[PDB]
Amino acid sequence: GIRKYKPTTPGRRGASVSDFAEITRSTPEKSLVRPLHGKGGRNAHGRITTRHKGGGHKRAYRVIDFRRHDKDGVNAKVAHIEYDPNRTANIALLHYLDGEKRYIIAPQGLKQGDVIESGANADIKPGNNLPLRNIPAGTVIHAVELRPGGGAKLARSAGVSIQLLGKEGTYAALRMPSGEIRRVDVRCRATVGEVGNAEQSNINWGKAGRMRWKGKRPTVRGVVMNPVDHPHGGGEGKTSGGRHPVSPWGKPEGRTRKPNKPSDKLIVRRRRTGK
RNA sequence: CUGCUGUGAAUCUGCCGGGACCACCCGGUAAGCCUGAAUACUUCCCAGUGACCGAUAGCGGAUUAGUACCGUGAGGGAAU
RNA sequence: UCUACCCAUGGCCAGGGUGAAGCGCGGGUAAGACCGCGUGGAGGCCCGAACCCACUUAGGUUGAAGACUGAGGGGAUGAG
RNA sequence: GAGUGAGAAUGCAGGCAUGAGUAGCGAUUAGGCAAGUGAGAACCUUGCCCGCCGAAAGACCAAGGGUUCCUGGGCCAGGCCAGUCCGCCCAGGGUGAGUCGGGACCUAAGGCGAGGCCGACAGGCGUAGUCGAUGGACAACGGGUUGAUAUUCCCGUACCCGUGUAUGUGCGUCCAUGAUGAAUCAGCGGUACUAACCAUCCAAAACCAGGGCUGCAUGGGACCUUCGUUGGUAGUAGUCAAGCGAUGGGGUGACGCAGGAAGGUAGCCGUACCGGUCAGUGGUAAUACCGGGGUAAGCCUGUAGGGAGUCAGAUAGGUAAAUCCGUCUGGCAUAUAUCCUGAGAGGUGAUGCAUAGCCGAGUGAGGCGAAUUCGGUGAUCCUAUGCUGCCGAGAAAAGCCUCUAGCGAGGACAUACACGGCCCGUACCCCAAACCAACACAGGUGGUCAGGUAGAGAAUACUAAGGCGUACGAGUGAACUAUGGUUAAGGAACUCGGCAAAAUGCCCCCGUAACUUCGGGAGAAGGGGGACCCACAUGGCGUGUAAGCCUUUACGGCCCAAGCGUGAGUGGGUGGCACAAACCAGUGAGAAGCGACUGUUUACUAAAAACACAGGUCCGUGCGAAGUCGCAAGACGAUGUAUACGGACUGACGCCUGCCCGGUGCUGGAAGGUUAAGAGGACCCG
RNA sequence: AAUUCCUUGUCGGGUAAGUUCCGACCUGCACGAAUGGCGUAACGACUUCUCAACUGUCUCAACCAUAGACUCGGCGAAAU
RNA sequence: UCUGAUCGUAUUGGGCCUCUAACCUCGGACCGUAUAUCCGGUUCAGGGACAGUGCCUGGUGGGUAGUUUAACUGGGGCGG
RNA sequence: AUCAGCUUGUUGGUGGGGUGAUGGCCUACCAAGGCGACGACGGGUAGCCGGCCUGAGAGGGUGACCGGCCACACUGGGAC
RNA sequence: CGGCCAACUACGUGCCAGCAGCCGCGGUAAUACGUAGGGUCCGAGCGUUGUCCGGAAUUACUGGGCGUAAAGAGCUCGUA
RNA sequence: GGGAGACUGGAAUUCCUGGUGUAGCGGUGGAAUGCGCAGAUAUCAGGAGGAACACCGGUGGCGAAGGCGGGUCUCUGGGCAGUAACUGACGCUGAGGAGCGAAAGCGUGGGGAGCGAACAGGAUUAGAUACCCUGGUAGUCCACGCCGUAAACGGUGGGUACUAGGUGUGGGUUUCCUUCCUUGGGAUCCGUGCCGUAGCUAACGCAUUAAGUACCCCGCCUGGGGAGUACGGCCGCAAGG
RNA sequence: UCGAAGGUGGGAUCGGCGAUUGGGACGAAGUCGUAACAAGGUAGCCGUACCGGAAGGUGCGGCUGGAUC
RNA sequence: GCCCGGAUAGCUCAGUCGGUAGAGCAGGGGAUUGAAAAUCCCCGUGUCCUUGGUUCGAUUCCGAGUCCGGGCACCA
RNA sequence: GCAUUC
Numbered sequence A: 001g002i003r004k005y006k007p008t009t010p011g012r013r014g015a016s017v018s019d020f021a022e023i024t025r026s027t028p029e030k031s032l033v034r035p036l037h038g039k040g041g042r043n044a045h046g047r048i049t050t051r052h053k054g055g056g057h058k059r060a061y062r063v064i065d066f067r068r069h070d071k072d073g074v075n076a077k078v079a080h081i082e083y084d085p086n087r088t089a090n091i092a093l094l095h096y097l098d099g100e101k102r103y104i105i106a107p108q109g110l111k112q113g114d115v116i117e118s119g120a121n122a123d124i125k126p127g128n129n130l131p132l133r134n135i136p137a138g139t140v141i142h143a144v145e146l147r148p149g150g151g152a153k154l155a156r157s158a159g160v161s162i163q164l165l166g167k168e169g170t171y172a173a174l175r176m177p178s179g180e181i182r183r184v185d186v187r188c189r190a191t192v193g194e195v196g197n198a199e200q201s202n203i204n205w206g207k208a209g210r211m212r213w214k215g216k217r218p219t220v221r222g223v224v225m226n227p228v229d230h231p232h233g234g235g236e237g238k239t240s241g242g243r244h245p246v247s248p249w250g251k252p253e254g255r256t257r258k259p260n261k262p263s264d265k266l267i268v269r270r271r272r273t274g275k
Numbered sequence B: 001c002u003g004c005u006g007u008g009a010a011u012c013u014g015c016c017g018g019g020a021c022c023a024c025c026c027g028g029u030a031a032g033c034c035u036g037a038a039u040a041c042u043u044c045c046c047a048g049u050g051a052c053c054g055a056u057a058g059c060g061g062a063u064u065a066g067u068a069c070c071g072u073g074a075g076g077g078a079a080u
Numbered sequence C: 001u002c003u004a005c006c007c008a009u010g011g012c013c014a015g016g017g018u019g020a021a022g023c024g025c026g027g028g029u030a031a032g033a034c035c036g037c038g039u040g041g042a043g044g045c046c047c048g049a050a051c052c053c054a055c056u057u058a059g060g061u062u063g064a065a066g067a068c069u070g071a072g073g074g075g076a077u078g079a080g
Numbered sequence D: 001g002a003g004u005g006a007g008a009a010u011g012c013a014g015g016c017a018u019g020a021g022u023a024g025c026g027a028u029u030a031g032g033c034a035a036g037u038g039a040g041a042a043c044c045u046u047g048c049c050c051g052c053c054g055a056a057a058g059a060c061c062a063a064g065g066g067u068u069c070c071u072g073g074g075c076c077a078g079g080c081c082a083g084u085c086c087g088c089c090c091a092g093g094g095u096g097a098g099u100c101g102g103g104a105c106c107u108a109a110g111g112c113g114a115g116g117c118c119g120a121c122a123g124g125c126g127u128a129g130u131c132g133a134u135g136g137a138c139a140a141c142g143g144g145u146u147g148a149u150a151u152u153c154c155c156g157u158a159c160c161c162g163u164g165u166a167u168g169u170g171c172g173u174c175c176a177u178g179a180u181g182a183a184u185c186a187g188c189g190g191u192a193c194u195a196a197c198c199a200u201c202c203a204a205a206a207c208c209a210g211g212g213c214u215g216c217a218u219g220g221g222a223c224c225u226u227c228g229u230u231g232g233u234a235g236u237a238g239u240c241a242a243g244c245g246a247u248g249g250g251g252u253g254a255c256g257c258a259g260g261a262a263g264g265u266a267g268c269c270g271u272a273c274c275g276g277u278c279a280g281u282g283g284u285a286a287u288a289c290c291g292g293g294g295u296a297a298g299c300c301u302g303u304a305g306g307g308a309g310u311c312a313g314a315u316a317g318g319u320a321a322a323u324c325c326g327u328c329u330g331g332c333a334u335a336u337a338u339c340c341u342g343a344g345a346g347g348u349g350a351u352g353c354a355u356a357g358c359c360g361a362g363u364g365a366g367g368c369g370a371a372u373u374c375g376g377u378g379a380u381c382c383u384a385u386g387c388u389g390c391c392g393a394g395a396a397a398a399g400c401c402u403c404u405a406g407c408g409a410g411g412a413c414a415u416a417c418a419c420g421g422c423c424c425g426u427a428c429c430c431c432a433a434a435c436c437a438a439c440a441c442a443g444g445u446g447g448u449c450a451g452g453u454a455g456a457g458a459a460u461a462c463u464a465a466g467g468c469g470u471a472c473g474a475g476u477g478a479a480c481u482a483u484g485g486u487u488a489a490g491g492a493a494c495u496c497g498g499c500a501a502a503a504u505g506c507c508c509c510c511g512u513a514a515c516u517u518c519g520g521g522a523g524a525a526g527g528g529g530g531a532c533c534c535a536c537a538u539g540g541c542g543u544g545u546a547a548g549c550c551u552u553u554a555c556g557g558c559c560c561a562a563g564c565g566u567g568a569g570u571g572g573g574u575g576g577c578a579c580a581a582a583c584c585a586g587u588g589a590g591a592a593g594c595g596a597c598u599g600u601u602u603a604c605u606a607a608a609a610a611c612a613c614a615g616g617u618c619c620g621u622g623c624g625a626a627g628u629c630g631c632a633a634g635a636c637g638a639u640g641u642a643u644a645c646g647g648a649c650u651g652a653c654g655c656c657u658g659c660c661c662g663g664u665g666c667u668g669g670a671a672g673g674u675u676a677a678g679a680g681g682a683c684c685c686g
Numbered sequence E: 001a002a003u004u005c006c007u008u009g010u011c012g013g014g015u016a017a018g019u020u021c022c023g024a025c026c027u028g029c030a031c032g033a034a035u036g037g038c039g040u041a042a043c044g045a046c047u048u049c050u051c052a053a054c055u056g057u058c059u060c061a062a063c064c065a066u067a068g069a070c071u072c073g074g075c076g077a078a079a080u
Numbered sequence F: 001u002c003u004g005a006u007c008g009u010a011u012u013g014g015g016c017c018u019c020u021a022a023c024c025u026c027g028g029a030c031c032g033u034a035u036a037u038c039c040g041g042u043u044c045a046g047g048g049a050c051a052g053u054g055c056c057u058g059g060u061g062g063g064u065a066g067u068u069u070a071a072c073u074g075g076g077g078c079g080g
Numbered sequence G: 001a002u003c004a005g006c007u008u009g010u011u012g013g014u015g016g017g018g019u020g021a022u023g024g025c026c027u028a029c030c031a032a033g034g035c036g037a038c039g040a041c042g043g044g045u046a047g048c049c050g051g052c053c054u055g056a057g058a059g060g061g062u063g064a065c066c067g068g069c070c071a072c073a074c075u076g077g078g079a080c
Numbered sequence H: 001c002g003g004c005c006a007a008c009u010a011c012g013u014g015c016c017a018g019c020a021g022c023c024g025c026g027g028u029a030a031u032a033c034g035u036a037g038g039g040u041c042c043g044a045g046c047g048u049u050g051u052c053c054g055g056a057a058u059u060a061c062u063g064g065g066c067g068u069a070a071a072g073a074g075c076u077c078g079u080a
Numbered sequence I: 001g002g003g004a005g006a007c008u009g010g011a012a013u014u015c016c017u018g019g020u021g022u023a024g025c026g027g028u029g030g031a032a033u034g035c036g037c038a039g040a041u042a043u044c045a046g047g048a049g050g051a052a053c054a055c056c057g058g059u060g061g062c063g064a065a066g067g068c069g070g071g072u073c074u075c076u077g078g079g080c081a082g083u084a085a086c087u088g089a090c091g092c093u094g095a096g097g098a099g100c101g102a103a104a105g106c107g108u109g110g111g112g113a114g115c116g117a118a119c120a121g122g123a124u125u126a127g128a129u130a131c132c133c134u135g136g137u138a139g140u141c142c143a144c145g146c147c148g149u150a151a152a153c154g155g156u157g158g159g160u161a162c163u164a165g166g167u168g169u170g171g172g173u174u175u176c177c178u179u180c181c182u183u184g185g186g187a188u189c190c191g192u193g194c195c196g197u198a199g200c201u202a203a204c205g206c207a208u209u210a211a212g213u214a215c216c217c218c219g220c221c222u223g224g225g226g227a228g229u230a231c232g233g234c235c236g237c238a239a240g241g
Numbered sequence J: 001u002c003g004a005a006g007g008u009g010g011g012a013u014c015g016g017c018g019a020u021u022g023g024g025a026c027g028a029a030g031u032c033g034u035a036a037c038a039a040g041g042u043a044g045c046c047g048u049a050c051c052g053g054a055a056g057g058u059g060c061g062g063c064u065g066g067a068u069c
Numbered sequence K: 001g002c003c004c005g006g007a008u009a010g011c012u013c014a015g016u017c018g019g020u021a022g023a024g025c026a027g028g029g030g031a032u033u034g035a036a037a038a039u040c041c042c043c044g045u046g047u048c049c050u051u052g053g054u055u056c057g058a059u060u061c062c063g064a065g066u067c068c069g070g071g072c073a074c075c076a
Numbered sequence L: 001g002c003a004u005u006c
């Protein structure tokens, strides 16, 4: 759920925080943690290539299993649900009967002690991962591969899910969280369920400093820059920019998907805008 | 004459040049290679010359001179 | 090697206030909501040194200083 | 034949005038006298005083500097005066490490980068690697000594890596003691070649206007075959048992922020005891006063605190194997049981070292040397990489431990003796005239120690240890300027404006409005008390010794007179103009505009109403995405996946956000009009 | 009106006196709904107006001390 | 053979559906390789004569670059 | 009730004081009580009664004179 | 002296001047206006205003109501 | 069809994809905006998605009222009859108070087919901020809160006893006639309708389901307007109650 | 010690005036529509919401205190 | 003040070529109605602001004057 | 279909 802060200070008025109710353990698996460091939005040239990044809390990477392909038939039990800094969803530590320990995105409703299984023979129960071929149409799924063996790429953020609409030949038709309908190979893997932590979107961060903790630097509006800095810059007093809205690099607001991408053959229709 | 991109021949009745192009004459024999001398220059070494300078001149530098000193640095840079 | 921003790894923030959530107990009820009393120690929270700023004013203005000094001023567990 | 004629280009170089014997001589501490030295003394030396700093202007470092350090000498440059002095000049001397700070150890960001990929060339990136501390690991403390170094030399006592010899205990390759487990022959049931048995489904050919045969398909039991069962051979021959053990596997290393409480110690304040003083004053001979009232690492011991279940069977998940780790099943556990970890107390180290004083004797060296108990207070240091809470969820590698793989005939451990322990730094300055500042410059410079009395305090006042008086002085009641001080009566009449001053200020009680997002507003406002002495008081509270009580007798527990410390209140008295006494230390109230708020900004005339902000909407983006850097490769976005990411405008919150798609963008469409190169090649011309 | 030229608009309030300020009117030169409109508790070294207290800001200036100024000795510039 | 309607044999262009073999894959596995999210090879699984990239060509193109933007004038601008 | 909470000598106790007398009447200590929708605490109005006026009565209104109580004596306080 | 409510006609103005407790009377023929004659009720008094009760069963105890006139809480549960 | 949760079914509207196929479709009192000719409407197939549940289905059932209808399953409330086994007046009502409470509306997050305030055009008209037409946003739907009103009506407060009958219908019991046919008929208990006596009512009407005859408790009225308004207060995010 | 009057302070509460501004009632023969009463020419009314010079219009749910059949 | 555009029926607006003055509303007379309004049918209404000039002829093509809308009156 | 007022 969401816990609302009391208005004891201007910075806290209106703000809220996760109740972290699903969290069972406060520390990660040592053997599944890798180091991570901040990039500040700078690339190999040391140039800022993504603005508004830097200054966030230090965090470590939990190795998430996005393939789940080498454990068909080996059941696992959910040992813990824990917080991950690197994504909106929570993560579930699985103990396989192999004695292997792996992290997976925690689906909605998955509790400690549940049994999870993988592969063609698995039951259609939240957290079970199996080829789309064996997933009946109409089911809600997440963490879907784009290419067989490529690893889960779609529907990974907290609360999101994909609906498997149907199967025809080698392809399954999927409705994306965005609403776009697209085809994927039926050999591609998916996990049954929605993604957990769906309440996170309702959090009111409350104050500038908390976004700084999350690594977001301030965004200066174009209209308050000078012409040399931004096409919207300039003018005496307040202005609307003095021209059609453009990026800081002058690109107009239009479609930016490249024409004639090969994936255009797999896309049935694009998302609808302003429905 | 020559680069890149397409297209793409004939072995002497051949082919290529004679300022679009054609004919006729003339010259030559492409898509293989090598080649001394006459020409250009002087960090450095030797022997000399000047209706050239003679210490604010002549080299930035006749004197610890690319030194002292200035500059983060590239670099600037004396005076005796 | 100034300055702007970022990355990694360390350090620093006298003293004094206020009293969030949570927890516990007692009222209250059919159970609650709710209400007292503790415990608790939250916060770009409060007052205020170090420290970081530079709001007002006087002096300096061939300065002690190519931007400073005195007197007050702001932030001071944090976007430090 | 000309580098041939200067008065001027805010011309250039050198020398030198004018201003002028003028302005200055660089803080907010301050010097004085006596004596000495010397040609010369306000400034040098010594003594006695005075003053200043004392979270520093004291003490120790990093960075930086580079001989500035010590001794002797110098005094025509330098020092804002003089100079016998100097951070200046000259000569000589001075820096000693297995343990300190680094390397020979380890990695972070980042750098470089074998091959490599990309790029006309130049080059751009980057893999394996290899560097790179601000972090990880790793062995020493106290005292003494030189003119100048000292955890480095010496003394005392330790600790950590190596090497050789000797001696003594067990452990063994070959001998042999213990230990397991596998091939194969032979006696048995369900897989199951294959011909059939049973149940069930279908119609080629099909009869007639529903009926049969045959074949096909599926499931069950059964012969061959094969797998499994249990008798022999085969513990026959194999294999394993002493240690070393990874470059490989697994643990640990291994981590945030806030917040106490508790238990300690350093330090400080007293005190038993010890040594000693009479400071020419009215009183004060021990009753008063002054000085001591010390001592590390290490090694014993294992308290407060914190942290943990253990054994057995199975396993190939851990890029091979595993007795290790992980996982799953069983049995036994809630104990002050056991073990790990760990402040401190105590013991030892220490018959030593050190010290208040006292001898003589002055160049200042040397000898002798007392007491050393008990309490109180108390850390920002230690237990603590702990514990509790929270969300923003908090390096790596080596090292260490363990596991096998693999090495193995020799090897492990203990004691004694004799030895090795490399390289670089080490002087001195280091909040400063020795670093950054052109200067012996009121600026700047990270870290470590933190005495006392007032006090909440690292504020502030005075002051101890220690360090300074810091480099022009001497005079003098001018105006005037600066910096402080006081002011009759009036009290904003000043002025653009209460600018600047003045005022308020502390602690404990009482008492506090509109409005509100119910948190606030609020220290709202307004008001009362505060000194000293005595009594209550041989009281209350903290601490806690003797005695006493309990016990799991120990580094136990309970209680506790005395002793020490310490408020708060009540009553009475006493003194002043004043009791927050000095220093220190909110002015308050009513209302409007703008911005919600804490923040950010024009280094050096603007700090704001500008920027940011949490919140909102739109647009883009389906994934080496969109966007951005790049010629590319590649990178960031993101080890993210539409509850995400980028861009645009708006800017907490409350109530709301109307009409226009003609213009110009953006999105979609393609029936018309128009339209490139490429195709075509009529006809015409030479 | 941080927007109003005319304009010190007009009326009310505050003052002995108010081109500023507060409340209104609407004749909006030339407001207006995310270059958001209208409000808003809390917050401000922002800007504006009023009051209490307080004062050398003033009526109106006087006196004291220190650093310069001034005198003597030493050193000894500068712009022009 | 011609006004013109048609069928099959060639030649040659346009569209559309497929196929695999060029080409592509930051999809999997394996090897070079002790080490290796580089790179290369092998192979499997997908795209596929499309895409990408040469050359030629028409658009969009203040994203960037070089430049232009007169004179007269009772100062210049505006007007003329 | 368009007035829901009020009270700290306030509610009770003991030892004193006080009065003609009982009693927080006063006082020191001790206990934490007392009064309230059977309207406490507030606000408004009013001297009360025998009676009078009206009315079939019940009731409504009223308190001049006469008679009984109470209260005050320019306003507020005090005692002798 | 219209009806309540005892007591009527003429003249004068004609929605004027005026009357009135209520309903209502005055618009050139008024028993309601003004005057006169007559009449009626009271009489040293008669009228008017104010005030209270009655009529008012119109706060209904005696002594009223709530389907449609004013009036059943939107519906339950339950405290005194 | 009393409530709650979960899952699920088909018809139809809309959209999408693809055939077939053209030039009209759509709409009205009559038209026009509108949708088409870039391939609509119509017709066929497939897909998506949301909302409401035809027939059964009634002046019938259940619920305190508001209300409740596709199916299935799970959890759960009330009512009625029969039997008198049990308790032994434990009852009734209820100022304040608490809870529930259509639709609209409000907050946050989803969803959005159809419908549709506002908003556009078209038409009508003197005008037409309407009625009619074409579109169309909040909303209507879901999750969790808030709001607390309706002609929330039987315009009829709750409990109890009594006072001619007749006739429908829903849920139980029982006696007879007997085929044992059974809507055969009777009696009885509990609902729900119609019609009618007595009695009541100003009348209309009510009439064993009272507005009759009586007892207990609550709420409410006191001429029409001003006004269910102002002020104060309480509640609410606001609207407002 | 207690203590009238007096002083100071921040609030309670009851009123009066107030530029400007809200609605209410009444008034003669004014202006604009025609919403209600008949099916009042779109049945009316109730709650609520949005809109419009005004009456009022429209949506959602409700009522008959609704005509014709 | 400078530069534009205006000025036509009672009102609001077209017209322009040098040979014109036309629309909607209002007004007047009929019709419809018991009577108004709405509606329907016949009618009337012009220095084309003033002013001079060109021309055979001016609403029209020039210059001037009055009145009225727009864009400007700036830099120290 | 339309049909306001006195």
Ligand SMILES: [Mg+2]
Pocket: A044
């Ligand atoms: Mg790099």
Ligand SMILES: [Mg+2]
Pocket: A051, A052, A219
């Ligand atoms: Mg951004």
Ligand SMILES: [Mg+2]
Pocket: A083, A084, A085, A086, A087, A088, A089, A090
């Ligand atoms: Mg997370």
Ligand SMILES: [Mg+2]
Pocket: A201, A203
């Ligand atoms: Mg968010």
Ligand SMILES: [Mg+2]
Pocket: A218, A219, A220, A221
């Ligand atoms: Mg911004």
Ligand SMILES: [Mg+2]
Pocket: A224, A225, A226
């Ligand atoms: Mg700007």
Ligand SMILES: [Mg+2]
Pocket: A227, A228, A230, A231
């Ligand atoms: Mg630009």
Ligand SMILES: [Mg+2]
Pocket: A236, A237, A238
């Ligand atoms: Mg502007």
Ligand SMILES: [Mg+2]
Pocket: none
């Ligand atoms: Mg979006």
Ligand SMILES: [Mg+2]
Pocket: none
């Ligand atoms: Mg040629």
Ligand SMILES: [Mg+2]
Pocket: none
């Ligand atoms: Mg050659």
Ligand SMILES: [Mg+2]
Pocket: none
């Ligand atoms: Mg010479």
Ligand SMILES: [Mg+2]
Pocket: none
């Ligand atoms: Mg020279």
Ligand SMILES: [Mg+2]
Pocket: B071
């Ligand atoms: Mg430079």
Ligand SMILES: [Mg+2]
Pocket: none
């Ligand atoms: Mg240098």
Ligand SMILES: [Mg+2]
Pocket: C045
């Ligand atoms: Mg703060």
